[PDB]
């Protein structure tokens, strides 16, 4: 479509040449659907998550849709993987899940790839 990645971070307003929160250059990651951008550290991503989100069509929090069913319904039930940031409805998982776990939860794609 008409998507162009924004050249500034939604959080600190810096470009890739200078994260204004850290005072260091830092690449931006940009939502595949709406083009909003953020520095990974401004998005509070780990370094491994930073690498992961650059390998697929990452979506920002607002655009995130479930990998399994494709909808953006039920924000309260859309888990974000703590290794790759993909979204999965707890009711789209099998076995479905009743409550967000405590501490990290990671998706089946990451379980297949990393373990």
């Amino acid at each position: 479509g008409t998507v162009i990645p924004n050249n500034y971070c939604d959080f600190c307003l810096g470009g890739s040449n200078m994260n204004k929160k850290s005072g260091r250059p830092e690449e931006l990651v940009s939502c595949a659907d709406c083009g909003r951008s953020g520095h990974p550290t401004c998005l509070q991503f780990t370094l491994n998550m930073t690498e992961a989100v650059k390998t697929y069509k990452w979506q920002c929090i607002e655009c995130k849709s479930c990998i399994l069913c494709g909808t953006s319904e039920n924000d309260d039930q859309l888990l974000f993987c703590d290794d790759c940031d993909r979204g999965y409805h707890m009711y789209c998982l099998n076995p479905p899940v009743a409550e967000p776990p405590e501490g990290s939860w990671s998706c089946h794609l990451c379980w297949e790839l990393l373990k």
């Binding site: 939604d10 959080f11 600190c12 909003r36 953020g38 401004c42 998005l43 509070q44 920002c60 929090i61 995130k64 924000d75 309260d76 039930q77 859309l78 888990l79 974000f80 703590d82 979204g87 967000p100 776990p101 405590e102 501490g103 990290s104 939860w105």
Partner: peptide
């Protein structure tokens, strides 16, 4: 674990 809802609430600095 994070959901969209909890992630929204903990990332308030997002434009």
């Amino acid at each position: 674990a994070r959901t969209k809802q909890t992630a929204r609430k903990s990332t308030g600095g997002k434009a």
